[model samples]
Target chain A: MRIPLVGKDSIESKDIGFTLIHEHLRVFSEAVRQQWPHLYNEDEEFRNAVNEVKRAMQFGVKTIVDPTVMGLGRDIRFMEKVVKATGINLVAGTGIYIYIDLPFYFLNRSIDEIADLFIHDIKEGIQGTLNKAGFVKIAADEPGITKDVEKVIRAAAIANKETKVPIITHSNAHNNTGLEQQRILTEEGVDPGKILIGHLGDTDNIDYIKKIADKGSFIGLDRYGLDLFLPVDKRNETTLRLIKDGYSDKIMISHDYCCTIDWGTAKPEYKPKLAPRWSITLIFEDTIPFLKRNGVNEEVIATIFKENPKKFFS
Target chain B: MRIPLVGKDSIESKDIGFTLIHEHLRVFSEAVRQQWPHLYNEDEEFRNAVNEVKRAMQFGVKTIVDPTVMGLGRDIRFMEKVVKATGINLVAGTGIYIYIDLPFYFLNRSIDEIADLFIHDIKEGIQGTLNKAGFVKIAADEPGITKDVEKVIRAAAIANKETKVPIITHSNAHNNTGLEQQRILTEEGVDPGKILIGHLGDTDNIDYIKKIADKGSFIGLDRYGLDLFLPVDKRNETTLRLIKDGYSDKIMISHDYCCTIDWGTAKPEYKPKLAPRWSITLIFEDTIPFLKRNGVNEEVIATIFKENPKKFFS
Candidate 1:
């Protein structure tokens, strides 16, 4: 089976070697981009963002699933340009990334209407581009599934049912809202295997990962270098536990790395603490070696990095 | 002292009459505005929103305090056009309207730099228009004073001291985060009298209202028709009680009405329920009559609407 790529072609799911299931090229609020374009140094940012992806490519990362959607300031046009520059296979998402209130644009819009947008992005080009989305991404943070948050999760499920696309989520692992999300999406009839509960690695609860993985959904140890949540070692230890407990096939790993997250690097106090070791290449350069030395071996690493994502898309 | 209007000249504070302290012409996310301009029908929306103001003008409403800021999708250019058409003196705002997490744009920026933008809007013009902001508007909602919320509150306070414009706030009456806001801003050296804590009408907790007033901060009975919190009769009785108790001088009145709020009006299930009687003219038409029938004299009404806003601005 082939997975739809962001701009033009499709790649066989098997062909996507060393896949990083969640990553971003650049993350920002497009509202700011529209109002204050000067705040950004796009040329420099583009160069840096492309170089980060290229660095990952050098370490054998062939495909990346970018979950940056409407809420997190996904600009498909910019993503298209980055994909063109890096030749990286990108699986774009179609859904909103809100934890509380829906944006005013979606305020009065019915659930079906919101779902229509995600399906449109999945089937047609996103934001009037030539590239279609390959998956649906929505978020439910520690704020829990407030009414508006539930609206987007349900909408993503509806979009998934229509498009037969995978549904990925940004969840609060501490609160175990990934289960809350699973309840909602499953209630809406989303296939269990097609649902990837993200940020599960942000927690130290191996049992929580087992519970979510046991339900037939994928789990993301995606926040590898966001040590503010949990240290990198703790995240890797949990990853090993999942593998040892017979859940390697359900594990997808990546650093939720962004080359230029406008919100992070702008503040002197925050930039250093947010994610110092955050890079798409972190798993390839650091995590893979750790797993190999721990005797997890290449066979399991390939199952997680490549086969897991391929089967999820299929 | 003269108060700045939206576009051109200044109006003497005492000369302003029948002011609604918190209202909006249109409420939306500018991010959506940038990406999907077609979602809005500005020509018709402008005519209708202007007509709403003009209807209020028929009942002697002169000035309006529009707390629409960057986070609320404020476009002073559009506001400039509205003021020109209606001759309604608009006290424009400069600040961000966020409840929990600061937007990605402000994440990397320091508090002083954030304050610089607010002060720039007040001292220069908002979004590079010739219209200087007449006040600073920020928010603290049901989520309580998260760090980012505190940053904006402190920024508004710093901006207040720099430009000496009144600081108006959107706060959660249910949780009484207005007092939390007061502590933060007062701790930052903003005068209590110059602070207007909005949405106090969303509660019947009159003692909470009095506590905010006792601190010398203005309290807003500003959400009159937004009876989802408290009934109209209850809001009026609270108004009468405040007038009788001698806190009239510290009260500001309005419906928190928006002619066209995008998140609203679009939801078929939401529009009819949102604010059936909501209008800029509601206080003038319904709230005043209710007050008069209940023995609260026009002298007290004048204090709430006219004098309090005048003194706050001065």
Candidate 2:
């Protein structure tokens, strides 16, 4: 259910096979570029994304869940371009990003108000905006939940209640913060079955991760191919442990890839690859092969890739 | 050589036997145990000190370096009993601790004046009221060097200039702070040979310890027997690594034990028993035999047990 990175609305996703649950398209502006200065731009972004996605389709990728939120402000304008150009089922998102500074109008708005805003976007579609947010994006800090996180939680809870859309949370390194968010949201009446805790793969402390997963929440192994934070082997080990623990039903994978951003300096490692996103590299380059080598079967991959996302998106 | 933990005022240096160059009869009075109405009391003070040193000797310990300083109230009274009871070398230190609330009467003082105070304690003994200090101790926090730490370093430099006594430092846990302290001290012309950075054995990251040893400083594996902060096996592993790395000559070992205030509640399971002051289960039971079984020779034991303090003490 993730979006595969493909350039110029290419027809690869339809012609080839599987779907990407996490991929990126154009998501930047002059201000953002000036601010970080290390992200990759259009050409490089397109090249990597297309190359990876084409390779992935060779293995049968047909769709992708590219939930690029408007708050990230990378490029909502290119959603159609990405779909038409790459030919992937790029399920676009419309929601607020956690920890982003709220506009002045929202400075004093209650969580109810924010939820109303999200519901409006989800139901009516952003009028001035290109597409509606299919998924709500939120984040939590590394330790305790800050007051700001409380507000975001309240907002997401309200939005989920109104729209029946599942809530996704950014957990700090796969710790209890994710479960804590689940608790807060569920206490406010959001369904546990509809919540996903992202970044659950960051920690090698398996017992700790399991305690969170046991709370009836899905644990996203989305940041699979990223290593800018800790060692890549740690990520691999955690995924292997999760699979071994029989929690594959609760699993989903994503590259968190990007398409384009201007680079005045060397491209940073975490930046999304340019358009023409390759779906094969996202999985088979190492992910699927490694999983298979470590004992996961094709059935498990199909379940995680198709069944889980279908259940989640539906 | 270090003073016997408990002995005649005039015991021969050889009678001091193998010296424990890092230990404490007691520490942290108000912070952790004030709530234990059943166990907290004033009379426990002298009894506890006596019990600690007594147990130390029972384990064949013959010397102890009491590194608690002015900020810690450097219990000279306990030092006297610890000496008379155990006959173990008890090297009492003179320096400052890291807690911020001492009222800072000495902070504005010149380095020479501070050194004069330190040296005066070294010579003619800690006149006016107390006795002489055997070592200079200091500590650093996370921020590399704080103002209080800087003054302590300056004063320690002056004290070293006058008394030629050894210096010890508490580097928290990371070992990063400790490296900075050593650099600051050596830059101030204090000999690294006279410096013992306690708690080196608490971390697996060996770069700092190895480099400190290479700088000719004694790296006190102060938590050699306790694994609470980490694990005993890991601490042992680190010490063994240090030994194999050929820095055995610069290593000192002891349990930082017998606090007047236990940390309020049940101690962590990983915490090795903090002795009145030696590794009990191992010593009266199995350490030497375990080493022998592990292929460590008597000479290695002698170096770790005997030569370390014998060489470092002077």
Candidate 3:
């Protein structure tokens, strides 16, 4: 099996080494861009985004699956630019992100119509670019599956059935949305193995994470540095515990960091001030050592960072 | 069949009366509210909201179905206050509104889970109040069925199927989003007769309006007086033409106006200036008269304003 990349063509799943299953190149509201164009300098932001991917590549992060879809302002053309600059295997995504409401256009469409759009991105291209999305990315947050969220989940499930692209999710581990996501995707006839439930690392709930893995879906211990939810040491403990319990095969790790996001009038330094360790390379710089010190073997870490992500797309 | 009103028991569908099928008591972002509470004055705004509903009642608005779901800042308890103050049938709605993205909580859910939330609002109550939502409100705009919008649409369809609550939509008539909406809802097995395609008045596309009505769904020549899209005269011509074409049974009219909305720092006088005739009474005060002078009889007016809405829920 091969994963699609922007600018460059496809790469075999097995050769996609040290893969960060979830990350973002950029995040902003297009509406805000239209309203306040000067708030963001596109060239400068794109340069910063490229630099971050290049930095991650130096740490042997060969691939980064960006689950930045419609709601997150996924511009495949912009991603193409970043990929050309950094030469990273930047896997783009397709789907919607809504914890409460969908964009008005999605509000009245059918499940199949929604799925067809995602399937197009997975099999065809995104936003008129020849960069086909390698995976279907949808989300669910603390509000649970309000009508709109469920719609995205089911549609992603349908897209997975059609395109055979792996389905990744932004789930709230605190609210147990991952379990609910699994139930819906599987109900839609999506193979559990083909699904990756993201943001599970936001919680240290091993029992909850295990329940998702027990169902054969990958659990994203992805948010490594966003300690505002749960501190890094605790997150590392949960990962080691999951590995000790022989759940390493179903554990995929990364930092859900993005280069640029719409933070509004907040200062440029607001991100580091708010989440000091919030960076794409945090897993490599800080987390791996935490794992090694706590008795998580290199084999388990490799399986999580490389083998599991490789196996996920395959 | 009965229509459930906030803060009151159900009324027979036929007794629902000369209802404005779609209108908002208030529309604002909850996230914005928490971040800047000073931006909105609760008691003052609620007072103004109450005044408008009371004002509309004098002009024969017995009921106002407000499709103020999650994204639109739905507060059933706040609506309950208005209902108690004005003694009008305010039918609350359950679903979502997504012009660009869904709320963070909705980002990770499934269709059944989302439908369950809508069903709970219709069957049990909304936000711990006994004020049951009478209909499922969803939307689609110019972007044309993006994944999040489709998710909400499908979830609304599922909720409608389960609870038999009629579906109402906010759609872009100019772009023919209503047709895309119909395709999805019908595919989900929701009876077209139970759905109301809103914002049809925004466009004077007679052929498009006829195509929607022919499919057995109601068209919302709603948004009367928001002349920026299409003036009341043009909207009137379209409505009269539909009636002349014998499609009165599938037409519903209203002004999708709200009492108070978060307009940033704009003055209270801003709305009337932006849309001169933008008021709840515009449908009755101006549109009906325009229709009458243009050869649409009182019988046709009653069918569109009263009977069609009654039949929609039934």
Candidate 4:
């Protein structure tokens, strides 16, 4: 099977070696940037995105799936530019990410109408291009599952059902939002094995991670470098613990790193100072070393890094 | 034409007297409320909404068109209770409100798919009620027509085209977002006369108001009470100026009041404290008297209050 990118570009899924399952190449609020043009320098943002992709390529990472859809400002034209420049395999995500209110367009829509859109993104193309989405990404954050959020989750589930693409989610581990996500998707007739309950590393509860994995879903030990939510040391400890407990096959790892994000008020320059390790290369430069030292074998690391992601799309 | 409300209820279009063109019955984040149930009290919220509607009904305000769609928590069942309790005509609104990102479902779909959903809301019931929307409410805030915003505006326009329902827009008057809204709706074959460019009261510019009026669209001096965005005194001055220039027929009035809104971080209890005049009765108790006292004739007042709104729906 071939993994898809912008406008008629596809690489064999097996060739997507050492892939980062979740990383944003570019994300910003289009509204904020439009209203306050001074806040975003497009050229600078594009350069930084390419630089981040190149950094990952330096660490032998071949592919990255960006789950930055409508809510997160997915610009496939810009992503196409970055992929052309760096030759990095970038998979575009197809789904919504709203913790509270859905955009007005989605609020009163039926599940079938919503699912048709997601299915269109995967099978037809994204941004009117022939670049099909390899996976479906939905999110259920702090607000558990509101009616609108549940509609989106069910839509994503239905989209996956039609396309057979893997479904990943931006789930809050603290609230066990993934369980609810899984429940909705499975209820919609999606296989549990096709879902990835992302942000699993954000919590240290091994039992919670095990619960997600036990249901045959992949646990995303993603958000590797963002020390603000959960420290790197604890995240590392949790990963090693899961590995030791024989759940390595049910895990995939990434930093959930965004090359550039316009968070409305947060200035881009202060991001490095705020999150020094929130880089794309955190896994190769820091997380892998820490995992190795903490007794996670090379085989288990390879499974998370390579084998599981392939199976996820297979 | 019969104006549809809650289950099996309808009112004559001519009888929709002293109507508030734009208002919200209840606006809150579903995810936030679901995660923290204490953040919202259903009974208390419903009572407050009923009380506000009753207050308006006492002012001879026969109808209040609430454009609170998916993004703003349009709960028709709860609204049904308030309508039943207060016996005020609450016309539901259909459309999305996003300055930037569309919900994932809408991000990739064709314009026809998105438009179909809005048409469904206008023809079919909102939230599974028999209460069909009287008008389509789209928004183009500070983002000034991003791709997603444009998509929604076009979709709303298309929906209006098919249903012949009037289109109301949440526009930023400061940036002349209303002009852009009119342009898009017109480009999509929606009559400019059928569109109400809301929040015209937020600006003091007579020329801007006149421009929107010149395009054959209704100018919404809708936000009468909120002093934070723009002072009521200046808003009154602008309205008088617009009327003096013979734009009375193109003007509509409302407080854009919300009975209960969960503004994410801002407490609902503090809303009245912050904007003391931000009440549903502001138009009747304060604004109309202010307008009448400031050399605005009863004929012009009748044009804005009775004749103009009747024309809009007719």
Question: Which candidate leads in DockQ?
Answer: 1
> Could you give the candidate ranking by DockQ, starting with the highest?
1, 4, 3, 2
How accurate locally is residue B273 in candidate 1, as Cα lDDT from 0 to 100? 72
After TM-score superposition, the amount by which residue B166's alpha carbon in candidate 1 deviates from its true location, in angstroms, is 0.4
**Chain A TM-score (model 2):** 0.80
**In order, what DockQ does each candidate have?**
0.30, 0.01, 0.02, 0.03
RMSD of candidate 3 to true structure, Å:
17.6
Total backbone collisions for each predicted model: 4, 72, 26, 1
Error of 1 at B110 (Å): 7.1
**Candidate 3 chain A lowest-lDDT run of ten:** A30-39
**After superposition, candidate 4 runs with Cα above 4 Å error:** A1-314
Tens digit of per-residue lDDT, candidate 1, span A1-314:
35788775888767878788988888788665544444678798789879898898888888888988875778777888888898888888778877788665664568898787787777766765767789988898878989999888888888988888999899999997999899889988998999999999999877888899889999988888887898888888898888888789899888888777777443424646766676678786678889898889878998998899988888
Model 2 stretches astray by more than 4 angstroms: A1-314, B1-7, B10-15, B29-40, B99-102, B127-130, B262-288
Give the alpha-carbon lDDT of every model: 0.82, 0.61, 0.79, 0.78
Q: What are the clashing pairs of model 4?
A: A104-B96
lDDT of 4: 0.78
Cα deviation at B247, candidate 1, in Å, is 6.0
Ranking by lDDT: 1, 3, 4, 2
TM-scores for all candidates: the values are 0.79, 0.45, 0.55, 0.56
Per-residue C-alpha lDDT of model 1 across residues B55-99, encoded as one tens digit per residue: 988988888888887667887788988888988888888788777
